[PDB]
């Protein structure tokens, strides 16, 4: 019985005042912690603000990226050590946008996952295949390799506590649309990979989120699929009213 | 009559409480703004804390990097619009470490400079040649090209208000050392390219910092160089006592 987890990725949106207003509007109105886990991945500029207002609530707080060293000569980078000290719960890593624009590799993601656990936090590891890979019938192999690479070297206990988010990158365009069948098939691809590398017992504990489009009238249907344990939500997490609406399924 | 500018680049160091304690120890002890401009480039996690503690002082506040769009689907990026909204003065762009680890290009830097001005802040534009380029005898040409690429499209008034930091990359972690002679030579190369592109009047206003090994014991000797207007200082800016000691040359 894996606990569902809806994480809202604000991406590069909101200043601290806007972030503050959002958390004040949502933190005290989330469903009970036993029913669903709810969190926000906020910009680094906004984190201390989000954490202060989220204090005493069930809203989990995630960073959108971090570097793989605790400190040093890495101008412009966010430390996982500092993230932990300020009270951050999760760190999103390997998001499609970072693997794209910012050249992040499987090796960087693996290093980040290790750094995040070394700093007592939990990673939300993103994966997903391109349109080209999808059209070539290679989604399962590509995603499988990504997942395996990211987890290599973690302990069984660390794997069991990780979150993995599957993004259907191929469905961003015009002529492609993802369905519940896609979410289920791809979330199972992730879990089977974890099973092959760490065993079925570990695989059955790791949460796998769907990162494709979910809406209030469909979120429940997607989450009810056997291998889908939550959602990494983009645009719909930017408004309090919209984010809260995605927690209705519980 | 170019006002000297010492900027302490903390790089990926300090949590918010550490950042607050530092500002508390240096804000009220800085020299008059008429003598020297003093700033701190702090991690994004610490910026709101630095800004609030520095409020009312003459301590300038800088970000260590930002993206070139105000908002959007850029997971993990720091917005220049939010940097302005919180009150940031400067943004360091093109630092050697980012051009290295994150493959940042001259095109990225040019877009960032424009974004920074569009948002009402000032850039600290970093440049500098590799050991290979240095050994090839092509330092002047290489650095000149970086400066020209970074400033292309900016107005003469924007260039006059910009800050450019020459980093002797060939003498950072290579077993080679750079001296006051290299600082003067290379800071003049920078100013000469500004003069060529925007006229000598503009060039005589742009502040060119040195980004090599500067310390309290030797800062005065570098500042005496006619074309050196400051320093973008790393390790020596982490301790309060040491940062203040970089400001006593006037
Ligand atoms: Na499910
Ligand atoms: Na300000
Ligand atoms: Na190096
Ligand atoms: Na050196
Ligand atoms: Na000088």
Swiss-Prot record, chains A, B:
Active site residues according to the UniProt entry: 95, 167
The EC number(s) this enzyme carries: 5.3.1.1
UniProt superkingdom: Bacteria
Pathway this chain belongs to: Carbohydrate biosynthesis; gluconeogenesis; Carbohydrate degradation; glycolysis; D-glyceraldehyde 3-phosphate from glycerone phosphate: step 1/1
Listed GO biological process terms: gluconeogenesis; glyceraldehyde-3-phosphate biosynthetic process; glycerol catabolic process; glycolytic process
Isomerase in keyword set: yes
Name of a matching Pfam family: TIM
Reactions accelerated catalytically: D-glyceraldehyde 3-phosphate = dihydroxyacetone phosphate
Matches recorded under CDD domains: TIM
Subcellular location: Cytoplasm
Gene Ontology molecular function terms on file: triose-phosphate isomerase activity
Keyword flag S-adenosyl-L-methionine: no
InterPro entries listed in its UniProt record: Aldolase_TIM, TIM_sf, TrioseP_Isoase_bac/euk, Triosephosphate_isomerase, Triosephosphate_isomerase_AS
Keywords: Cytoplasm, Gluconeogenesis, Glycolysis, Isomerase
UniProt GO cellular component terms: cytosol
Enzyme class: isomerase
Main location as per UniProt: cytoplasm
Positions that bind substrate: 9-11, 173, 213, 234-235
SUPFAM superfamilies: Triosephosphate isomerase (TIM) (SSF51351)
Quaternary structure annotation from Swiss-Prot or TrEMBL: Homodimer.
Described function: Involved in the gluconeogenesis. Catalyzes stereospecifically the conversion of dihydroxyacetone phosphate (DHAP) to D-glyceraldehyde-3-phosphate (G3P).
Family membership noted in the UniProt record: Belongs to the triosephosphate isomerase family.
Protein's name according to its UniProt entry: Triosephosphate isomerase
């Amino acid at each position: 019985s894996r606990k569902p987890f809806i994480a809202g990725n604000w991406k590069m949106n909101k200043n601290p005042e806007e972030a503050k207003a959002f958390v004040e509007a949502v933190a005290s109105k989330l469903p009970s912690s036993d029913l669903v886990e709810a969190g926000i991945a906020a910009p680094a500029l906004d984190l201390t603000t989000v954490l202060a207002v989220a204090k005493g609530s069930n809203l989990k707080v995630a960073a959108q990226n971090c570097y793989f060293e605790n400190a040093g000569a890495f101008t412009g980078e966010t430390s996982p050590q500092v993230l932990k000290e300020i009270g951050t719960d999760y760190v999103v890593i390997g998001h499609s946008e970072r693997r794209d624009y910012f050249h992040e590799t499987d090796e960087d993601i693996n290093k980040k996952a290790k750094a995040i656990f070394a700093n007592g936090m939990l990673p939300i590891i993103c994966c997903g295949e391109s349109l080209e890979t999808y059209e070539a019938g290679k989604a399962a192999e590509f995603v499988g390799a990504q997942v395996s690479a990211a987890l290599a070297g973690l302990t069984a206990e660390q794997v069991a506590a990780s979150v993995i988010a599957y993004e259907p990158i191929w469905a961003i365009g015009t002529g492609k649309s993802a369905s519940q069948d896609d979410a289920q098939k791809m979330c199972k691809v992730v879990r089977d990979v974890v099973a092959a590398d760490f065993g079925q017992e570990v695989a059955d504990k790791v949460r796998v989120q769907y990162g494709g489009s979910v809406k209030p009238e469909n979120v429940a249907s997607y989450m009810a699929c056997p291998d889908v344990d939550g959602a990494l939500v983009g645009g719909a997490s930017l408004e309090a009213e919209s984010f809260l609406a995605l927690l209705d399924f519980v």
